[PDB]
Design a protein around this ligand. Sequence first.
Ligand code: HEM
Ligand code: HEM
Ligand SMILES: CN(C)c1ccc(CNCc2ccc3ccc(N)nc3c2)cc1
Ligand SMILES: CN(C)c1ccc(CNCc2ccc3ccc(N)nc3c2)cc1
Ligand SMILES: C[C@H](O)[C@H](O)[C@H]1CNc2nc(N)[nH]c(=O)c2N1
Ligand SMILES: C[C@H](O)[C@H](O)[C@H]1CNc2nc(N)[nH]c(=O)c2N1
Ligand SMILES: [Zn+2]
Lengths: 407, 411
Amino acid sequence: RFLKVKNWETDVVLTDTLHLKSTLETGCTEHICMGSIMLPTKDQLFPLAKEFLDQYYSSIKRFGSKAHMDRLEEVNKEIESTSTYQLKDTELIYGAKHAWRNASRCVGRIQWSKLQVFDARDCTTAHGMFNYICNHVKYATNKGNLRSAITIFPQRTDGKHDFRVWNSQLIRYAGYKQPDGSTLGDPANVQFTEICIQQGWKAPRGRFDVLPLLLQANGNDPELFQIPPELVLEVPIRHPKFDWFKDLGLKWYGLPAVSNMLLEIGGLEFSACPFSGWYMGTEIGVRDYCDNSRYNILEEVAKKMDLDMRKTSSLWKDQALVEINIAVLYSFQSDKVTIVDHHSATESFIKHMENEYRCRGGCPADWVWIVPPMSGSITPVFHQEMLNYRLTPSFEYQPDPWNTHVW
Amino acid sequence: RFLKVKNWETDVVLTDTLHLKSTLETGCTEHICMGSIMLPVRTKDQLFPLAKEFLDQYYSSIKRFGSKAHMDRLEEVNKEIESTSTYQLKDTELIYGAKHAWRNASRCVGRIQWSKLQVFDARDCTTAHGMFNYICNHVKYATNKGNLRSAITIFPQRTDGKHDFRVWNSQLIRYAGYKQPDGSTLGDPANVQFTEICIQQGWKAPRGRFDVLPLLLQANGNDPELFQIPPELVLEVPIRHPKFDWFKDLGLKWYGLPAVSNMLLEIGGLEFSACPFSGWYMGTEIGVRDYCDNSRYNILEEVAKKMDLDMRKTSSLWKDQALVEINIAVLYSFQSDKVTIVDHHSATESFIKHMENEYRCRGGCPADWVWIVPPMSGSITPVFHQEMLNYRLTPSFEYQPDPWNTHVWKG
Ligand code: HEM
Ligand code: HEM
Ligand SMILES: CN(C)c1ccc(CNCc2ccc3ccc(N)nc3c2)cc1
Ligand SMILES: CN(C)c1ccc(CNCc2ccc3ccc(N)nc3c2)cc1
Ligand SMILES: C[C@H](O)[C@H](O)[C@H]1CNc2nc(N)[nH]c(=O)c2N1
Ligand SMILES: C[C@H](O)[C@H](O)[C@H]1CNc2nc(N)[nH]c(=O)c2N1
Ligand SMILES: [Zn+2]
């Protein structure tokens, strides 16, 4: 019932108890582990609120206080009446910070308590949503000195009045399907790049076109808005060695702002809650650039390095993969845009784990995602045993809106 | 109950039914995943159904399920169990069992080779000297002058747990590690404890950086004995780099034959506690883990200095850079000396094919993503994007406690 995790590089053992407060399910059973699978009423509502308020009041050392007891009946009454309830701002902020704190797949959680929370629950229209989103982008971007942020739009009522940001991230590059067979721009967004057109977007059918926002307020049809370019910070990618690197014509945006997840707090569902932090270098250089189903520039780069690509055994891909990532980090740092390398981030996470085990009794973590997509075993997290379990408040995945939307 | 895995690079979706045949537990539950936890005397009572499940398996594979040969064998094993409290496997069953334990090994990326396994039956062995002989023959057969051949040598099964055969070494061939008084380590840090045992057991350590450890062999529950593998049987490869000429001067070499010797092989409820086995190296085992783990030879810095990398910021990825070059060297040296090795791209690619074949011909393929994905360049190998299901089938290879921790000393 009380669990030990060992780090095999340092022999340090930690003891986990936090998992005992887990309420949601993993997907695994005693007969089968699903650790590498990508995606596994007033009745329901009241214990959920209670559990949350219990956490919350415990966290401010007023467990079993009048304020506590009072808030509990107050919420209970409101549920009885309205069949839902509203969070106080303090609870909203606490809830959002803790959804981040509990995100078992996020290596960046040492920053969790410094989250700027923007309350957009008063928002009613797609234009309103756009305004709030532009403000988020400008604040978080902060001229390159990035600051984490989340903007929280009104909670689900009857699932027919949902607020949804249709983009997967606030800022992403378009992808169009060619006659040449392949794909210009970003293959991951070919379908979304299509749906923008299907609703009226004018694509400059280029390679790195910042996609428009597709905003759904209150269950209505979504609307197109162009993010002001002066708000979209971008970074041109050059190698501090290969002077030819620049002619590949690569750039990337500085702000990673995931916009399609669901924030759950005390049973309440926030279907539109775009949030942002800053990039770990490998996200762009390894995944975005070198994934086969993405920008897939490995061959091209390798050509320009005149490497022996005759056999897998020369490790040409590996050699190039490193240089590319050196360039990403180089470009960002030179342009003074916040970025972190996988060594620093993982080092920070181990420190964060130590802290969480110490002050909270543990830290849910998904090794499959915490370990970076390159040079895994030379980062400390590779040798770190981790326990994965689901805590609430949480960020959850949710179905793409075009599949659900009753037009 | 059917289960689907998706490859997110190819959208290829597969359906697992094999997981239904799983008996053993994973460690995980509905509320916690232990997927990254490293390591998470049996009665006639529980033995028979285990024998029966094995024998049903075996007779199905040979397409004789429900035959009279099947039924008589079950009867024979039943009688032998209740009479003697255990039973002996036929050679055929032993071979089938060893192959399938390999086949069921969810953490092994090399399983496409599982059906080509040379099984050496050492169940007639009675002494440590006998064990040394068998092991020498294994090493010689498996090495084959550099054209490596997979093999397993199987010593007598456990009886009352007081008469175990064990190979105390973790691998048949490994380098000594020596802790110095100044706290530094000479040789392979991983083998310090084992090196000390050997020394205490009377091994004269030459105390160099690459000393092949002696074999420490336990027969029939007796105290273990020391033997030196004949040097001419130990194939080694000097490590050089195809472009960096200073690399040779780092003084590195490695042995060609990876031969894990401390696992327990389980077949039909019988436990084979000494079953050393060998295949060949995937390059990163040596180039990434053995050389570059901080708790191993840890040569990243010295390599990095000599390539003149910016070692001032991690952000320069000097570590990543040196890591690749070292792995380039390992592959280069082995191929140059015609010693079988496989790069991580080739191995992972072959595994994906194996896996798909296994889903179709067998209904599934248990696989441990945490272990299948290579320790460098993870996402540019196809396994990274492959959803996998992990579950335990028998026959299987299992860990067992280190024998110095359990052994009852006779003196
Ligand atoms: C501030 C610096 C941050 C860094 C360096 C960082 C890093 C990462 C990385 C590398 C991943 C792996 C995802 C992938 O490879 O696609 C991840 C996942 C994730 N991050 Fe963080 N992140 C940061 C901030 C945040 C913030 C501010 C939030 C929310 C408020 C957040 C929530 C999440 C969630 C929910 C996931 C996984 C989603 C899932 O369940 O699959 N992160 N992060
Ligand atoms: C023939 C070439 C082979 C290759 C390239 C190969 C590759 C690997 C690799 C890279 C690992 C990961 C272990 C680590 O990184 O420490 C592994 C694990 C494993 N292999 Fe293979 N292997 C081969 C042959 C074999 C054979 C012949 C057997 C048994 C008959 C076997 C049984 C296992 C088992 C049981 C594990 C899990 C080890 C553990 O959980 O500690 N392998 N293999
Ligand atoms: C299941 N599925 C189809 C899927 C999986 C992953 C993704 C990509 N978002 C992962 C993420 C989240 C938050 C992040 C925060 C900061 C950062 N620097 N990076 C972050 C990256 C999209 C879709
Ligand atoms: C602490 N722990 C549980 C642990 C972890 C790793 C190891 C290292 N041996 C793993 C192995 C097994 C079989 C192999 C077969 C062929 C090959 N080319 N390589 C193989 C590598 C030992 C023990
Ligand atoms: C804690 C963690 O599970 C442990 O370090 C594992 C990770 N994956 C691995 N994968 C392989 N192939 N070999 C290993 O030793 C490990 N170690
Ligand atoms: C199949 C597998 O689960 C999938 O490729 C995962 C593996 N680990 C990952 N890790 C991170 N950080 N991001 C990812 O998208 C993935 N993808
Ligand atoms: Zn699991």
